[PDB]
Amino acid sequence: VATNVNLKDQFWKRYIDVVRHEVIPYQWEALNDRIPDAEPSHAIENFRIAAGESDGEFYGMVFQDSDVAKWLEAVAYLLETKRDPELEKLADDVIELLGRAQQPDGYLNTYYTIKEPGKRWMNLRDNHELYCAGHLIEAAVAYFRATGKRRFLDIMCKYADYIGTVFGRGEGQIPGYDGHQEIELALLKLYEVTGNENYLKLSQYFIDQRGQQPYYFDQEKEARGETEPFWYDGGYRYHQAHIPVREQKQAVGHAVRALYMYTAMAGLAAKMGDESLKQACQTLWENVTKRQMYITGGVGSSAFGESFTFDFDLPNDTAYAETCASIALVFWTRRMLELEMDGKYADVMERALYNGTISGMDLDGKKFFYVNPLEVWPKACERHDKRHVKPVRQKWFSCACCPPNLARLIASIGHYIYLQTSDALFVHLYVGSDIQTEIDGRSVKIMQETNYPWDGTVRLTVSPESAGEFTLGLRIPGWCRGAEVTINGEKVDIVPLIKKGYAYIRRVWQQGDEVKLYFPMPVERIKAHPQVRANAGKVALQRGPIVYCLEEVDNGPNLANLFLPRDAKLEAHFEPDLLEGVVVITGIAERVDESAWNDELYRPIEPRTYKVPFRAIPYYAWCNRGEGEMVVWVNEK
Amino acid sequence: VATNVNLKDQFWKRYIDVVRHEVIPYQWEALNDRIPDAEPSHAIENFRIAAGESDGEFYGMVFQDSDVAKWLEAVAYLLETKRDPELEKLADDVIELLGRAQQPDGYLNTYYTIKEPGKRWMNLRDNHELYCAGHLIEAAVAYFRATGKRRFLDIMCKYADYIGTVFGRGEGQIPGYDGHQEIELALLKLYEVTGNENYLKLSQYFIDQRGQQPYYFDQEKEARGETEPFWYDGGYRYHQAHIPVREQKQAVGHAVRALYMYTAMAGLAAKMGDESLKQACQTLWENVTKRQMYITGGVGSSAFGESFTFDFDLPNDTAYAETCASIALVFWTRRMLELEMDGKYADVMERALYNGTISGMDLDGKKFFYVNPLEVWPKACERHDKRHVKPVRQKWFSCACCPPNLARLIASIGHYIYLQTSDALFVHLYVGSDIQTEIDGRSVKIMQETNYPWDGTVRLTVSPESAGEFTLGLRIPGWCRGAEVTINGEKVDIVPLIKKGYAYIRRVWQQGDEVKLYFPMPVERIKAHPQVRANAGKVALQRGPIVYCLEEVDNGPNLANLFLPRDAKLEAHFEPDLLEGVVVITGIAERVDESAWNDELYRPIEPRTYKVPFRAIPYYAWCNRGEGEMVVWVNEK
Secondary structure, eight states, rough: OOOOOOOSSHHHHHHHIIIIIIHHHHHHHHTTOOSSSOOOOOOOHHHHHHHTSSSSOOOSOTTHHHHHHHHHHHHHHHHHOOOOSSHHHHHHHHHHHHHHSSSSTTTTHHIIIITTTTTSSOTTTOOOOHHHHHHEEEEEEHHHHHOOOHHHHHHHHHHHHHHEEEEEEESSBBBOOSSOOOOOHHHHHHHHHHHHHHHHHHHHHHHHHOOOOOOOOHHHHHHHTTSOOOSSGGGGGTOSSSSSSOOOOOOOOOOHHHHHHHHHHHHHHHHHHHHHHHHHHHHHHHHHHHHHHOTTSEEEEEEEGBBOOOOOOOOSSSOOOHHHHHHHHHHHHHHHHHHHHOOOHHHHHHIIIIIIGGGGTTTTTTTSSSSSEEEOOGGGGGSGGTTTOOOOOOOOOSSSSSSHHHHHHHHHHGGGGGESSSEEEEOOSOOOOEEEEEHHHHHOOOOOEEEEEEEEEEEEEEESSSEEEEEEEEEOOOOOOOOOOOEETOOOOTTTTTTTTEOOOOOOOHHHHHHHHHHHHOEEEEETTTOOOOTTTTTEEEETEEHHHHHHOOOOOOOOEEOOOTTTEEEEEETTTTTTTTTEEEEEEEOOOOOOOSSSSSOOOOEEEEEEEEEEEEGGTSSSSSSOEESSEEEEE | OOOEEEEEOOOHHHHHHHHHIIIIHHHHHHTTTOOSSSSSOHHHHHHHTTTTSSSSEEEEEEEETHHHHHHHHHHHHHHSOOEEEEEHHHHHHHHHHHHHOOTTTTTOIIIIIISTTTTSSSSTSOHHHHHHHHHHHHHHHHHHHHHOOHHHHHHHHHHHHHHHHHHHTTTTOOOOSSSOOHHHHHHHHHHHOOOOOHHHHHHHHHHTTTSSSHHHHHHHHHHTTOSSSSSSGGGGGGGOOOGGGOOEEEEOEHHHHHHHHHHHHHHHHOOOOOOHHHHHHHHHHHHHHHHHHOOTTTOBBTTTTEEEOOOOOOSSOOOOOOOOHHHHHHHHHHHHHHOOOHHHHHHHHHHHIIIIIEEEEEEEESSSSSSOSSSEHHHHHHGGGGOOOOOOOOOOSSSSSSSHHHHHHTTGGGTTTEOOOSEEEEEOOOOOOOEEEEEEEEEEEEEEEEEETTEEEEEEEEEEOOEEEEEEEEEEOOTTOOOOOEEEEEEEOOOHHHHHHHEEEEEETTTTTTEEEEOOEEEEEEEEEEOOGGGEEEEEEEEEEEOOOOEEHHHOOOOTTTTTTTSSOOOEETTTTTSEEEEEEEEEEEEEOOOTTOOOOOEEEOOOOOEEEEEEEEEEGGGGGOOEEEEEEEOOO
């Protein structure tokens, strides 16, 4: 493949700069208990103790080891854009410490090495051993791809090989699997970087075993003398272990869990060319993205179990839409594109990336949300049914969806832009960047320049070492109508070339060939399916891939009583000095007069209305200018 | 002195017969553990054991004793409108049982007699001792007024005197009060029937002491050795015991508790001539009824704590609106009227009486709601944050709230229709009835005939034994746009006679004088104050005092996808055989056609709508024709 991708834009480059200079350095301090304000992490200390370099007790959540891995993974990806010896040094040191904390059989887990040794693999449902293992594997694979150093990969292959001995359907093995999926998608990347088929088979095994009767979680449960019912009403639906994955057609249960599982299913369907996995992914995909996904790319409608509920139940004010769930959605869409090239997967990838993902952090990377609501009345957040919604971003405990999660996605943004297949180069995302690659063994550089998401002109430059025929696959964004393409100033009728949202342009390509794409970005009035009861009579503003919202700081309070008339004229313009440089939308809305109301609650008096201008900003950029109300779905006319 | 009201109705007399033939007999069977499927009550049996007439253990909730009291109270009121020697013989036996279960000092509490003897008064925050005493006192007063038999009253006077020695300021007294208000209003009635002012001062003491520092509940807490913090995050706001009642300006906490407290407060303001309590009551009245009350007369917007939240937070789908809280609202308004004669108090009484109280039962009286929601999507009742909303009514085994609570209010409805002062007969409610009473000495009979609430025409016949001058005060309903009055066919100019929602008609009345009242009853479109976020862009249908709703059985599924145009062609007509004979509202609405989505979730389309006829029925009558969607607040076009 011999591929390499560099970022050359403003929008994502700023985010990476923030991850590099703010988020990773701060997270490193917290992981090392050097922040006197903060609640202690003990994440690195747990490994020192496990390694025999420090006395003390284990401290933290059962999956504390995964914090370190995700930090290491983000650091690996940062090392790809800017090679940075101080960083590479701390990471190498953490890796060596990890090597020393690893047992000779390969097992690497601090909670069981320090606090409950010999009780390992006895609570797969709850204690995240395989989940921590998986995040560790992902970190080593990325660290290898980034630096070429294989120490971390050797450490993790040993753990994988040991896990491969323990788990299975053969003699003396445990027919088990994790309560929290992750090892399956991690095993795939280990396979993809080692060539070792055993890791493919192990991933296949964990997926194939899930949900099989009699339920492995009932068996380990009983063996622990435990009789209390599982707290989630839906039972093993919470872990998507209720039935085998090939029979799962409805998204249920914990959202991050489901999406980690579907990501793995999709990668396995591709590797095996297995239709049953592929069709289960496709059906689950339709269910999620056409019935249980917010307009922000948010997923998970219920604070209880941080879960999916059922089709069309997408309340805006009690939404959960965990940042990590949106991240997991990105992971899934990328594997879906490798399994079948359909623009709709990249559409959703882009929806999550420019909305319900980076909304999880302040512009300057200093604070974060766990929960990403589509409507906030800060006062109402004292209600019990909304206490999961924090009206301003904050610093976070060993919560579960720690900031290194968003960090590793942002720092790896470049890996999601293009896909190289032998015949065809696919462009998924419209991002100032280049890629040096091989097509037909032909060395080729492709370059994109664009101010997207703020404008829909993309100039692609295609420079092959020597002229040659190959295919350029350009995603046609599903939000756009009327995409246009020119090649060297010549119009190209793309309508006969599009297959499932990509335009296949196969020709002889020469040094300097220029492809201009134009995606008109009008302000759009988005309407939800009438079955989405929460949005009856409501409209959302969107421009390009970016969903807009109204905040109190620009529009005043009581946003429920700002109405957007159907043929108000709407205007967009760039504001270089607002929220790091955003396009804003403005127009004339209507408010309901309150003054005629005379200390009365209910009256037969039809509303008197008055014009006010409104300003809408990008959903991701909300809550950077003080606490206040915010809405995405606005009342119409 | 002697005052008699008999219902001559169809509307309320049908509820009374349901209460007499279905509810009270069934509840007797359940209280007596004679129902083979039902969860045993053991409420009577606890008294048999405490009386030494049976061996066994206490069973039930800590307030189980008040279940018996509430049944006896309802029974007292039934005996007023129809004496039944069998029912009465039953009540007398139960009464003597209470007599024999009572401790020698007057304490009557089964839990603290058979399960924890000697440990009484140790947990006033939780154990409902004074609450059960208050309910027993109310049953005794009621039973005496109804039968003349003083026995139950002697028993409870003895308990009441005992309570007077235990609680107060000074040595050998506990400076305490109940976690669940009730004893305070009950003691007012005991005073009213006995003239013993110690009962009045005891009520005052309990009200005056509440919320003083250091917190009484903190002291008994420390003596119990308990240290983990109270479950409700608002602490003693739940009990309205966070600050003295005279400094309470907003309704907070558990709604029934709040309203039982405000009722006593209003009673004491009148009986002591206490301006500070009168003011406090008025302030709280305005807060509840202008900012924290549903259009149905429901109060209580959060299932967590069954509590008030804050101003203008009135969600329809997650409403609590506990039946017993609207009931309590009725008790409060009746006391508010004895304190300040203003039609607003009776307006709210009527609101709660014709909507959110009787909505708590099936029309045939066999099933009940605890929670009275304003919007139901049955599938969404599976969400954790809506699991308190049952989409059909049912039998209720443990309670706290319901059936004898509703029964006692329905059975005593005649007591809310009129108020007799020295000078003046006030007509609060337009109910087919007659009242024989004494005005400025004279024997006077007044007869009301009307089809209210279905029609706004009323005829009052005034038949004093001999002719005489007195004032007839007639409530002008706040929902009406004008009233017309004639006396013996001649017109009365009433505008000069109206003071605070009552028309004062003072003249010499003669036998057979005929007052005719006309209240126009158009179909009204009701708007909520703009600060009520939940109802931005929605409208509710009302006719007279009755609030209307749309049900799936008449209108099809997806009631959120129903829009009511500016001219919706609203008609009303009587359906004599539907839901016990009701007026239905009909009209034209619009629905969005789903097909333009092509199964997509979010699209920039101009939706095609289509016209449908709709039918609305009284809220109270919803859920008598099968499970389905229901909405009160409908989307406006």
